[PDB]
């Protein structure tokens, strides 16, 4: 069995609808449901957690006085079930704020570190879904990468555009370059291959 964290941006910008009938928030919610349905129906043994960033409330183990704010652990590492399907579809809504995606990545790594203790997994995996419009701080990023390597975590980034231009903001361009630096540190030239579109996300998650 493998262990997977789905780390999803629900900040206010994800709710902006200018690429078809579904906003990026709606599209990512849809991919997450299809993936979780596949896992339930095949009776897979993999365990799946869900971390949301950009939420109006704060609920995570690291939140303390202006730190790791507006990040919520919606589902801990467990087998997926039908209650989770109901929650995702009805409860989970867009936030009215924005949050820091490296904060969210650390919350996800801390979750895997604690909740895989003493068990054997074939792989540990974090999948991030975002449009990269929110600002972030790079403080301690070298520590994040060192622990991704030691723990042998496989990382995948999914974006609602491929990388005529798309009108990406400077903040989005900075986020994309930071994703490239992270993936090259882990896997080299081949590492940049592990950056994908929402369109291709369901199939890449599954292999």
């Amino acid at each position: 069995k493998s262990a997977v964290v789905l780390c999803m941006d629900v900040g206010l910008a994800m709710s902006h609808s200018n690429q078809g009938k579904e906003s990026p928030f709606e599209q990512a919610k849809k991919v997450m449901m299809l993936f979780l349905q596949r896992q339930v129906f095949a009776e897979s043994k993999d365990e799946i957690a869900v971390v949301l960033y950009g939420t109006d409330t704060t609920d995570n183990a690291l939140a303390r006085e202006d730190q790791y704010e507006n990040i919520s652990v919606h589902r801990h590492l467990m087998l997926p079930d039908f209650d989770l399907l109901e929650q995702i579809e009805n409860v989970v809504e867009p936030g009215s704020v924005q949050a820091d995606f490296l904060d969210a990545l650390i919350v996800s790594m801390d979750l895997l570190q604690k909740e895989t203790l003493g068990k054997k997994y074939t792989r540990l995996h974090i999948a991030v879904f975002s449009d990269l419009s929110s600002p972030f701080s790079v403080d301690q990023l070298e520590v994040i990468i060192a622990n991704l390597k030691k723990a042998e975590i496989t990382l995948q980034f999914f974006l609602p555009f491929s990388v005529p231009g798309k009108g990406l903001s400077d903040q989005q361009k900075e986020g994309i370059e930071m994703v490239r630096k992270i993936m090259f540190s882990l896997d080299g030239e081949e590492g940049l291959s592990e950056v994908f579109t929402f369109r291709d996300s369901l199939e890449r998650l599954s292999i």
């Binding site: 730190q67 650390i106 790594m109 570190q113 600002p135 701080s137 790079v138 403080d139 900075e174 930071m178």
Partner: peptide, 13 residues
């Protein structure tokens, strides 16, 4: 993008 300080949890030391 900024450099606002953050504290990583102790296990990542």
């Amino acid at each position: 993008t900024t450099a606002q300080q953050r504290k990583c949890p102790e296990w990542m030391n």
